[PDB]
Design a protein around this ligand. Structure first.
Ligand SMILES: [Mg+2]
Length: 266
């Protein structure tokens, strides 16, 4: 188990360095997310609002959270729901135009599953809920944190991290020309140069786009090992798993076909 092919073994090696780097970047972003959650969780404006919910105390909150959105760029939406799950503050940011602002539409959401999940969470504990889409293509990871003042719960931070954004920010290495795809633990893709294979567990006509079923022999290593590669004699597949805000493993993949293994130089 180790020979080989020289040109192809070199490539994998480089592929693995790339996954080491980009993985580390992901770590940072996720730590950024938790950091921001705490600040947001402790922001003054929030406290002031929490005790005295005027429209003057709101306005300052909103203004504040909107500067965070417009400054951090990676949050599609930032929200406080009360202990009863009513959105009291709902900020949206759009990195295409880069305006952050308060919504006027507030909704009860104590129906939705993720809120109940939110429930079963310790004060100040940050976990991630699944991945969501928009229309009907724009996806977002959803992050949750129960918030309390003097171990007395008050409401819930909910974040929507823009995966389309991260993805175009982390997933292509121009020096090395490697696309890093993102594959969830369930086997479905949430990022790829190839758009048609995305979200097979949301879009039923994509359901065959699952790693366990596209690469039956490799999937198992990807699942149980922290990093490595494998050649199936059609594709070389290099992988390394990280933890991203949940502690659901997320698998970063570099995947090259035989044809692509035509690696020259410029
Ligand atoms: Mg880069």
């Amino acid at each position: 188990q180790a020979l080989l092919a020289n040109n192809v073994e070199n490539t994998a090696k480089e592929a693995l360095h790339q996954l080491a780097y980009t993985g580390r970047e992901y770590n940072n972003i996720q730590d950024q997310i938790e950091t921001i959650s705490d600040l947001l969780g402790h922001s003054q404006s929030l406290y002031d609002y929490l005790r005295e919910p005027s429209k003057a105390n709101l306005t300052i909150l909103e203004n504040m959270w909107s500067s965070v959105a417009r400054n951090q760029k990676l949050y599609k939406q930032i929200r406080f729901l009360d202990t009863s799950g009513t959105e009291k503050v709902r900020i949206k940011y759009d990195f295409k135009t880069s305006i952050a602002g308060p919504s006027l539409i507030l909704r009860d959401k104590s129906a939705r599953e993720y809120f109940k999940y939110a429930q079963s969470l310790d004060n100040e504990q940050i976990s991630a809920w699944g991945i969501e889409l928009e229309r009907d293509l724009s996806p977002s990871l959803r992050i949750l944190m129960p918030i309390s003042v003097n171990d007395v719960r008050q409401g819930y931070l909910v974040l929507n991290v823009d995966i389309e954004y991260l993805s175009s920010l982390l997933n292509y290495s121009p020096v090395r020309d490697f696309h890093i795809e993102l594959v969830k633990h369930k086997g479905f893709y949430i990022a790829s140069p190839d758009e048609s294979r995305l979200y097979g567990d949301i879009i039923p006509e994509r359901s065959q786009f699952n790693f366990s079923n596209m690469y039956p022999d490799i999937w198992p290593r990807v699942v149980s090992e922290q990093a490595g590669y494998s050649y199936s004699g059609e594709h070389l597949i290099a992988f390394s798993s990280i933890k991203f805000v949940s502690n659901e493993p997320l698998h970063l993949i570099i995947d090259l076909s035989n044809e692509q293994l035509s690696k020259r130089a410029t």
